[PDB]
Design a protein around this ligand. Structure first.
Ligand SMILES: COc1ccc(Cl)cc1C(=O)NCCc1ccc(S(=O)(=O)NC(=O)NC2CCCCC2)cc1
Ligand SMILES: CC(C)CCC[C@@H](C)[C@H]1CC[C@H]2[C@@H]3CC=C4C[C@@H](O)CC[C@]4(C)[C@H]3CC[C@]12C
Ligand SMILES: CC(C)CCC[C@@H](C)[C@H]1CC[C@H]2[C@@H]3CC=C4C[C@@H](O)CC[C@]4(C)[C@H]3CC[C@]12C
Ligand SMILES: CC(C)CCC[C@@H](C)[C@H]1CC[C@H]2[C@@H]3CC=C4C[C@@H](O)CC[C@]4(C)[C@H]3CC[C@]12C
Ligand SMILES: CC(C)CCC[C@@H](C)[C@H]1CC[C@H]2[C@@H]3CC=C4C[C@@H](O)CC[C@]4(C)[C@H]3CC[C@]12C
Ligand SMILES: CC(C)CCC[C@@H](C)[C@H]1CC[C@H]2[C@@H]3CC=C4C[C@@H](O)CC[C@]4(C)[C@H]3CC[C@]12C
Ligand SMILES: CC(C)CCC[C@@H](C)[C@H]1CC[C@H]2[C@@H]3CC=C4C[C@@H](O)CC[C@]4(C)[C@H]3CC[C@]12C
Ligand SMILES: CC(C)CCC[C@@H](C)[C@H]1CC[C@H]2[C@@H]3CC=C4C[C@@H](O)CC[C@]4(C)[C@H]3CC[C@]12C
Ligand SMILES: CC(C)CCC[C@@H](C)[C@H]1CC[C@H]2[C@@H]3CC=C4C[C@@H](O)CC[C@]4(C)[C@H]3CC[C@]12C
Length: 872
């Protein structure tokens, strides 16, 4: 509706509190163009003094010392003005914002409970409306004032140089807008590209028992690594486009600098209506205005989100980040692409010190007596600007492409390795409710893409800042080291102006409806006190950050004037040293603000490594065991005790002492829960026994290879989970290993009572399963599952309550297929339904799991069994 409707207050105190802060923000915004005007005056004074100095060695009533103490005093006064004004802005704005937001929360809470008979998102929505109103609207006003006044005095002092700079501004505007649009477009494209690999991951992890039972760990990994390339390539494309566009923006900026300096030089030398100080003032003022306009996009983003969340509440009224040293170790194969990226960082790190050097050269060449040599030097510096712009284009593009490629390769490798590790875990690891299909998929998709922040981009920005600081120090200490040390004294504070920014930013009936009107109002004193203390400390930090640059400039320029009056050094050297050191300090301060991504990436890397470095009790990838000759399935149960660590409901899981010879059926019929499916897990070694032994053969379960054991058992789950690849991929999947011919599949299909149906389809055998086909009937996917179970020719069958189809017509087909699937082989079938013949085996398991009944269809009459219990 409007961000002016947020402040519903006619209260005088809040309005005046906001008004004073807004006035001080306006004054602070005024300060920077004014200090730039003073800077232009100094530049004019320096140039005039240098000209007279050169003339005197081939007027004089200037006394550069007096002018420089006057300018330094003006700078100190502006510094204290900035300190006071910024303190007022932050303190008053955040205090008033906290007051109004707590009043709104109080009104909301008093209004919700009195009426006829997403909450913490609300807390975060009020959080964001207070965020839109506390400091975003003060900084926005200050930056708007800064840019408007910068453009205004740029026009006022000279209306042509600012005119051409404005005329060249749009191309940069179009480039920035296109970059902003691409930020979201490529995010959407990357999500669409990764959708397929994510779908594969969810399909595999969702049904992990089936994947592990058939030993299809390698096949799913193969599918995942095959599908990951389509998202890796889109990551590469986004990276290269972004790098090229940022290089284009940088090259355009440097071309603008060259054009402005050539045009200003022509105006100053030929026409003469511009003095060089006016040129410097105009250029710096327009640059400051552009920077302030660019920096306001965040603030406008906040304003938007906040109006939005009050549009949300307007009608409710009226484990350890320790390991990082191994991230490089894990990223060893991508050593060249990072190295090349480092070359991109080490080259584009020098652009700021070189820009300071070239600006100082332009300033110092304005005192050259020769007009033609002046023009030649200016032309040379403009050509250097053009060359540096082109170099920045190429280097930014190359750095972006290389680091995006390294990050995407690392993400793909991490995703594949994490998927392999997840597939290698035991079944119990998937029931913790902290490693869930959704959470595991999130870890595969998001965390791996996040580790690249600590891996590649972090190294790049570190190298960029290190090279920036090194080159700036080399420039500063090679011309005047004394002034270099003087400004280096303020260097740590200038860096901390941005380094500590994040560290401080991130830090009805029976009820009488009248008791709670008083227990809530007094509760909000402490949040108000902490808010006002935080606002005061924020104000002090922000005011110090804003005024430290002015103080440093004042002191350094006073000392530079002293040096010029005493030591025979150019003013251009003073400008060079001071500007280079200040810019390097700003860059370094921007560098240490890396925590919001670096800490998250380190947490992500730690979680992965913890997942990868886990040794499970039952390792499918382990080759430990002893059973090899003539498998027959002489399964035996001895006093097996199970606690079921997922849920301690039936920790007394004992009484199972059955043992069947090879070729014997064994039906487990008992209660509806905790007596049906546990032995399935024990036979599959999904969980190892705790206080019992499962004696599969001459050797026990705990000491037989899991791969070999699962290879000999055919599993038919309760619900038939089938992959969406193909019928062949869903029938030959049972023997996922080699030695699978197109034969032995026709026999399995015939034995599964499916060959006629699979023959009826036009796509006879290459039919695709899923939403792209017609197989939704249970009595057909169940038959494909049974076929997949039988093609491996397993000695043991593990029916797990199949034939759960409502239509009896399909039930008869699946049950006759299962009956033809046994053919005198060991099996443990769970059948709540009475379809299975009771002559298969004896009813022995009760609710507790105790095994007592053993007689062949004659002890079930004296003792309550399956049918005898139901008939009473
Ligand atoms: C002070 O510029 C220079 C003078 C000479 C040279 Cl070779 C380079 C620069 C330079 O740095 N070019 C980078 C672009 C730039 C500069 C300043 C600002 S700024 O934010 O307006 N600076 C202040 O507010 N501090 C003032 C500056 C004047 C003295 C008193 C303190 C914003 C952007
Ligand atoms: C824009 C710069 C250059 C000039 C200074 C602007 C100041 C005076 C503006 C900026 C934001 C403004 C406030 C924005 C919204 C409201 C809510 C409305 O219900 C009453 C007026 C009030 C409280 C405004 C008072 C004036 C205000 C503080
Ligand atoms: C809040 C109290 C303590 C201080 C108020 C600070 C105000 C009045 C100061 C801060 C910066 C100052 C400006 C800085 C530089 C210039 C350029 C000069 O050629 C004319 C004056 C002018 C435009 C100043 C006007 C007054 C000014 C806006
Ligand atoms: C319009 C956008 C894309 C920015 C580009 C504008 C350029 C091409 C314009 C802006 C100012 C112009 C200059 C203004 C005045 C002079 C003086 C003399 O030497 C003749 C040409 C020359 C040097 C012009 C050449 C073209 C020029 C440099
Ligand atoms: C395309 C938009 C962004 C404007 C960029 C134009 C820039 C790169 C162009 C416009 C005018 C050009 C100048 C025109 C003429 C000369 C004189 C020659 O002896 C040396 C190069 C020099 C000094 C050129 C340097 C590059 C220059 C400043
Ligand atoms: C050109 C200069 C400035 C920087 C060069 C790049 C440096 C900082 C970085 C970029 C990527 C880094 C490599 C990334 C990963 C590994 C694998 C592991 O065994 C640790 C060392 C090693 C081999 C790193 C060595 C240092 C390295 C090459
Ligand atoms: C984005 C870039 C490529 C835009 C093109 C602008 C640059 C590359 C072009 C425009 C005009 C060119 C200048 C035109 C003429 C001369 C005079 C010659 O004796 C030296 C080279 C020099 C000074 C050229 C250097 C390159 C130049 C500045
Ligand atoms: C890393 C950054 C932030 C700070 C580095 C400060 C270093 C480079 C400074 C601190 C003290 C300095 C020295 C102080 C005095 C002299 C004596 C004379 O011969 C000039 C150079 C020399 C020898 C300086 C060289 C640079 C120096 C060693
Ligand atoms: C590395 C940073 C923090 C600087 C640390 C040293 C600072 C605090 C001190 C130690 C030695 C000092 C210098 C010693 C001698 C002189 C000569 C005299 O004309 C005063 C300025 C000057 C040039 C001093 C400037 C300040 C100085 C550089």
């Amino acid at each position: 509706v409007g961000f002016f409707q947020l402040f519903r207050f006619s209260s005088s105190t809040d309005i005046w509190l906001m008004f004073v802060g807004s006035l001080c923000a306006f004054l602070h915004g005024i300060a920077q163009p004014g200090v730039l005007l003073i800077f232009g005056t100094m530049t004019d004074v320096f140039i005039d003094y240098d000209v007279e100095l050169q003339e005197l060695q081939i007027c004089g009533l200037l006394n550069i010392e007096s002018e420089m103490i006057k300018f330094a005093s003006y700078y100190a006064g502006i510094a204290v003005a900035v300190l006071i004004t910024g303190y007022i802005q932050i303190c008053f704005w955040v205090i008033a914002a906290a007051r109004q937001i707590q009043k709104m929360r109080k009104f909301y809470f008093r209004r919700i409970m009195r009426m006829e008979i997403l909450n913490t998102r609300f807390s975060d929505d009020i959080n964001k409306i207070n965020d839109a109103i506390a400091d975003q609207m003060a900084l926005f006003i200050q930056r708007m004032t800064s840019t408007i006044c910068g453009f205004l005095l740029g026009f006022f002092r000279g209306w042509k140089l600012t005119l051409v700079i404005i005329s060249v501004s749009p191309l940069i505007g179009i480039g920035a807008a296109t970059i902003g649009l691409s930020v979201s477009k490529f995010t959407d494209y990357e999500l669409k590209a990764y959708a397929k690999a994510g779908v594969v991951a969810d399909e595999v992890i969702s049904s992990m028992r089936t994947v592990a039972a058939f030993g299809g760990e390698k096949r799913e990994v193969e599918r995942y690594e095959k599908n990951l390339v389509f998202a890796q390539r889109w990551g590469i494309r986004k990276g290269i486009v972004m790098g090229f566009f940022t290089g284009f923006v940088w090259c355009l900026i440097f071309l603008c600098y060259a054009l402005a300096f050539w045009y200003g030089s022509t105006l100053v030398l030929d026409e003469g209506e511009y003095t060089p100080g006016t040129l410097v003032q105009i250029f710096l003022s327009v640059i400051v205005g552009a920077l302030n306009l660019g920096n306001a996009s965040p603030c406008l983003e906040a304003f938007a989100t906040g109006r939005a969340a009050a549009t949300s509440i307007f009608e409710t009224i009226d484990v350890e980040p320790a390991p990082v040293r191994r991230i490089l170790k894990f990223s060893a194969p991508e050593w060249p692409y990072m190295l090349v990226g480092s070359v991109g960082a080490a080259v584009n790190g020098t652009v700021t010190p070189l820009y300071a050097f070239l600006f100082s050269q332009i300033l110092g060449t304005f005192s050259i007596p020769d007009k033609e040599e002046q023009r030649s030097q200016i032309n040379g510096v403009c050509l250097l600007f053009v060359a540096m712009g082109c170099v920045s284009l190429f280097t930014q593009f190359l750095q972006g492409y290389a680091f995006a490629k390294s990050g995407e390769l690392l993400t793909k490798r991490l995703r594949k390795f994490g998927f392999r590790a997840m597939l290698g875990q035991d079944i119990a690891w998937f029931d913790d409710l902290r490693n869930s299909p959704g959470a595991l998929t999130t870890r595969l998709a998001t965390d791996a893409s996040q580790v690249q922040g600590a891996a590649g981009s972090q190294i790049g920005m570190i190298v960029n800042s290190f090279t920036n600081v090194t080159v700036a120090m080399i420039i500063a200490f090679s011309f005047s080291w004394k002034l270099s040390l003087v400004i280096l004294c303020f260097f740590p504070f200038l860096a901390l102006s941005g380094a500590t920014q994040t560290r401080m930013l991130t830090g009805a009936g029976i009820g009488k409806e009248r008791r709670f009107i008083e227990a809530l109002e007094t509760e909000l004193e402490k949040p108000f006190k902490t808010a006002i203390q935080k606002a005061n400390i924020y104000g002090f930090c922000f005011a110090f950050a804003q005024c430290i640059m002015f103080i440093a400039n004042s002191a350094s320029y006073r000392y530079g004037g002293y040096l010029i009056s005493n030591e025979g050094l150019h003013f251009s050297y003073v400008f060079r040293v001071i500007s280079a050191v200040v810019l390097s300090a700003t860059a370094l301060g921007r560098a240490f603000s890396y925590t919001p991504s670096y800490a998250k990436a380190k947490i992500s890397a730690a979680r992965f490594f913890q997942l990868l470095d886990r040794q499970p009790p039952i390792s499918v990838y382990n080759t430990a065991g002893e059973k090899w000759d003539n498998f027959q399935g002489k399964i035996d149960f001895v006093d097996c005790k199970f606690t079921y660590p997922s849920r301690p409901d039936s920790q007394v899981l004992n009484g199972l002492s059955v043992s069947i010879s090879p070729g014997q059926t064994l039906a487990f019929v008992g209660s509806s829960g905790c007596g049906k499916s546990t032995s399935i897990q024990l036979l599959e070694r999904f969980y190892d026994p705790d206080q019992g032994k499962v004696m599969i053969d001459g050797h026990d379960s705990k000491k037989v290879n899991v791969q070999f054991l699962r290879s000999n058992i055919g599993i038919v789950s309760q619900e038939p989970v089938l992959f969406a690849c193909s019928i062949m991929d869903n029938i030959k999947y049972g023997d996922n290993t080699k030695e699978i011919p197109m034969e032995r599949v026709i026999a399995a299909a015939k034995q599964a009572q499916l060959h006629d149906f699979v023959m009826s389809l036009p796509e006879k055998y290459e039919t695709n399963v899923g939403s792209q086909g017609s197989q939704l009937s249970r009595g057909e996917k169940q038959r494909i599952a049974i076929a997949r179970a039988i093609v491996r020719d397993p000695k043991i069958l593990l029916l797990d309550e199949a034939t759960s189809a409502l239509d009896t017509e399909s039930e008869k087909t699946v049950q006759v297929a299962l009956d033809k699937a046994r053919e005198g082989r060991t099996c443990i079938v769970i059948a709540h339904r009475l379809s299975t013949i009771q002559n298969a085996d004896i009813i022995a398991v009760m609710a507790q799991g105790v095994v007592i009944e053993k007689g062949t269809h004659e002890e079930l009459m004296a003792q309550k069994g399956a049918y005898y219990k139901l008939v009473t």
